[PDB]
Design an enzyme around this catalytic site. Structure first.
Site, PDB file in Angstrom:
ATOM      1  N   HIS A   1       9.490  61.480  74.486  1.00 12.20           N
ATOM      2  CA  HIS A   1      10.434  62.517  74.882  1.00 12.20           C
ATOM      3  C   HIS A   1      11.381  62.080  75.988  1.00 12.20           C
ATOM      4  CE1 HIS A   1       7.541  63.850  78.174  1.00 12.20           C
ATOM      5  NE2 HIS A   1       8.706  63.915  78.792  1.00 12.20           N
TER       6      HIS A   1
ATOM      7  N   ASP B   1      10.850  66.626  68.918  1.00 12.83           N
ATOM      8  CA  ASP B   1      11.090  67.321  70.172  1.00 12.83           C
ATOM      9  C   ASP B   1      11.203  68.836  70.006  1.00 12.83           C
ATOM     10  OD1 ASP B   1      13.732  67.531  69.301  1.00 12.83           O
ATOM     11  OD2 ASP B   1      14.572  66.858  71.221  1.00 12.83           O
TER      12      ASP B   1
ATOM     13  N   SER C   1       6.104  61.874  83.576  1.00 10.36           N
ATOM     14  CA  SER C   1       6.134  61.718  82.125  1.00 10.36           C
ATOM     15  C   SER C   1       6.184  60.256  81.729  1.00 10.36           C
ATOM     16  CB  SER C   1       7.387  62.390  81.539  1.00 10.36           C
ATOM     17  OG  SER C   1       7.285  63.798  81.561  1.00 10.36           O
ATOM     18  N   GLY C   2       5.397  59.904  80.717  1.00  7.30           N
ATOM     19  CA  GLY C   2       5.372  58.562  80.200  1.00  7.30           C
ATOM     20  C   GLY C   2       4.402  57.634  80.891  1.00  7.30           C
TER      21      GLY C   2
HETATM   22  C1  LIG Z   1       7.932  64.502  82.621  1.00  7.51           C
HETATM   23  O1  LIG Z   1       7.768  63.881  83.833  1.00  7.51           O
HETATM   24  C2  LIG Z   1       9.446  64.422  82.374  1.00  7.51           C
HETATM   25  N1  LIG Z   1      10.011  64.724  81.171  1.00  7.51           N
HETATM   26  C3  LIG Z   1      11.412  64.511  81.242  1.00  7.51           C
HETATM   27  C4  LIG Z   1      12.276  64.739  80.170  1.00  7.51           C
HETATM   28  C5  LIG Z   1      13.663  64.486  80.345  1.00  7.51           C
HETATM   29  C6  LIG Z   1      14.132  64.025  81.559  1.00  7.51           C
HETATM   30  C7  LIG Z   1      13.266  63.811  82.632  1.00  7.51           C
HETATM   31  C8  LIG Z   1      11.877  64.051  82.471  1.00  7.51           C
HETATM   32  S1  LIG Z   1      10.564  63.900  83.518  1.00  7.51           S
HETATM   33  C9  LIG Z   1       7.372  65.892  82.684  1.00  7.51           C
HETATM   34  C10 LIG Z   1       5.878  65.831  83.021  1.00  7.51           C
HETATM   35  C11 LIG Z   1       5.359  67.269  83.342  1.00  7.51           C
HETATM   36  C12 LIG Z   1       3.833  67.247  83.499  1.00  7.51           C
HETATM   37  N2  LIG Z   1       3.463  68.570  83.918  1.00  7.51           N
HETATM   38  C13 LIG Z   1       2.118  68.891  84.253  1.00  7.51           C
HETATM   39  N3  LIG Z   1       1.220  68.009  84.140  1.00  7.51           N
HETATM   40  N4  LIG Z   1       1.873  70.201  84.636  1.00  7.51           N
HETATM   41  N5  LIG Z   1       7.501  66.540  81.388  1.00  7.51           N
HETATM   42  C14 LIG Z   1       8.368  67.674  81.235  1.00  7.51           C
HETATM   43  O2  LIG Z   1       9.044  68.106  82.149  1.00  7.51           O
HETATM   44  C15 LIG Z   1       8.356  68.229  79.811  1.00  7.51           C
HETATM   45  C16 LIG Z   1       9.519  67.611  79.060  1.00  7.51           C
HETATM   46  C17 LIG Z   1       9.572  68.032  77.551  1.00  7.51           C
HETATM   47  C18 LIG Z   1      10.798  67.306  76.907  1.00  7.51           C
HETATM   48  C19 LIG Z   1       8.263  67.640  76.819  1.00  7.51           C
HETATM   49  N6  LIG Z   1       8.508  69.654  79.837  1.00  7.51           N
HETATM   50  C20 LIG Z   1       7.453  70.471  80.449  1.00  7.51           C
HETATM   51  O3  LIG Z   1       6.503  69.936  80.935  1.00  7.51           O
HETATM   52  C21 LIG Z   1       7.677  71.971  80.381  1.00  7.51           C
HETATM   53  C22 LIG Z   1       6.983  72.584  79.152  1.00  7.51           C
HETATM   54  C23 LIG Z   1       6.998  71.930  77.912  1.00  7.51           C
HETATM   55  C24 LIG Z   1       6.372  72.526  76.805  1.00  7.51           C
HETATM   56  C25 LIG Z   1       5.729  73.757  76.936  1.00  7.51           C
HETATM   57  C26 LIG Z   1       5.728  74.415  78.170  1.00  7.51           C
HETATM   58  C27 LIG Z   1       5.021  75.773  78.342  1.00  7.51           C
HETATM   59  N7  LIG Z   1       6.016  76.937  78.641  1.00  7.51           N
HETATM   60  C28 LIG Z   1       5.761  78.255  78.022  1.00  7.51           C
HETATM   61  C29 LIG Z   1       6.701  79.423  78.284  1.00  7.51           C
HETATM   62  O4  LIG Z   1       4.819  78.388  77.336  1.00  7.51           O
HETATM   63  C30 LIG Z   1       6.342  73.820  79.275  1.00  7.51           C
END
Ligand SMILES: *[C@@](O)(c1nc2ccccc2s1)[C@H](CCCNC(=N)N)NC(=O)[C@H](CC(C)C)NC(=O)Cc1cccc(CNC(C)=O)c1
Ligand SMILES: [Cl-]
Ligand SMILES: [Cl-]
Ligand SMILES: [Cl-]
Ligand SMILES: [Cl-]
Ligand SMILES: [Cl-]
Length: 241
Positions: free
Chosen positions: A42, A91, A191-192
């Site tokens: 992602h 995605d 992430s990653g």
């Molecule tokens: C990652 O560090 C990053 N992902 C991206 C993507 C694009 C640019 C920069 C970065 S940094 C981060 C890790 C989060 C780990 N969180 C915990 N361990 N608590 N991942 C995210 O930010 C991801 C990115 C998506 C593209 C997978 N998004 C989320 O973590 C937010 C999220 C995703 C899916 C479901 C939910 C639940 N929300 C609801 C209303 O149910 C939240």
């Protein structure tokens, strides 16, 4: 990483920092051989006018401790030649969230730069197992990243509990790791990066890839990680590792 502490220099020599587009650190990765990293698919998706899918826009920093000390002795910079996302990644649901990054030129192994072992396909990391998460991500949800690499110890959560806490979101490729009470968790910018598991004989294996979560470090909202044993053969087929 929320609720962690500063890693020691050289403590996680497989942890990589991926920078793109002059934006600084964006995502983590892990070193698995001289030419290959594991990360999250992602992170490599074009978005907001930024061509994150273009491997030529990325720089991998190996042996890094502090984002403000990128020229410290032992830090290596490498370009990426290609990004291979899992063919079942998408995605919409973020299922199969894993990618392989090929370095343009091989890493030079040292005390500060060396690979993490991949687990066999038959290995299962059981509920309760202690695992380390590391990265330069936010130290609070909605907060700011860490200059110095952070570490935190978390535990595998029961898969049925995970599914029930995050309904209609957890596939069998995903694993919840953290604490039901919260407090220690990965966060945006982790992430990653790898989960690092110390096994019974002291050997460390990669146990997953940081993927997503609902907020960070909240009660009943542990981090969600891509499992790694499932992908052992895919990694071998695509990298030779
Ligand atoms: C990652 O560090 C990053 N992902 C991206 C993507 C694009 C640019 C920069 C970065 S940094 C981060 C890790 C989060 C780990 N969180 C915990 N361990 N608590 N991942 C995210 O930010 C991801 C990115 C998506 C593209 C997978 N998004 C989320 O973590 C937010 C999220 C995703 C899916 C479901 C939910 C639940 N929300 C609801 C209303 O149910 C939240
Ligand atoms: Cl290789
Ligand atoms: Cl290079
Ligand atoms: Cl597993
Ligand atoms: Cl549990
Ligand atoms: Cl509760």
């Amino acid at each position: 990483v929320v609720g962690g502490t500063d890693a020691d220099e050289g403590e996680w020599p497989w942890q990589v920092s991926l920078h793109a587009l002059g934006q600084g650190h964006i995502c983590g990765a892990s070193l698995i051989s001289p030419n290959w990293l594991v990360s999250a698919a992602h992170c490599y998706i074009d978005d907001r006018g930024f061509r994150y899918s273009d491997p030529t826009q990325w720089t991998a920093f190996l042996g890094l401790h502090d984002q403000s000390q990128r020229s410290a002795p032992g830090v290596q910079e490498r370009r990426l030649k290609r990004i291979i996302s899992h063919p079942f990644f998408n995605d919409f649901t973020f299922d199969y969230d894993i990618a392989l990054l090929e370095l343009e030129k091989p890493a030079e192994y040292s005390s500060m730069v060396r690979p993490i072992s991949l687990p066999d396909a038959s290995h299962v990391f059981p509920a309760g197992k202690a695992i380390w998460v590391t990265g330069w991500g936010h130290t609070q949800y909605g907060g700011t990243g860490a200059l110095i690499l952070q570490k935190g110890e978390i535990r595998v959560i029961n898969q049925t509990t995970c599914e029930n806490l995050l309904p209609q979101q957890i596939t069998p490729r995903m694993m919840c790791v953290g604490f039901l009470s919260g407090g220690v968790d990965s966060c945006q910018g982790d992430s990653g990066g790898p989960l690092s598991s110390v096994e019974a004989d002291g050997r460390i294996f990669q146990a997953g890839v940081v993927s997503w979560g609902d907020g960070c470090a909240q009660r009943n909202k542990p981090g969600v990680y891509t499992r790694l044993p499932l992908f052992r053969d895919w990694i071998k087929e695509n990298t030779g590792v």
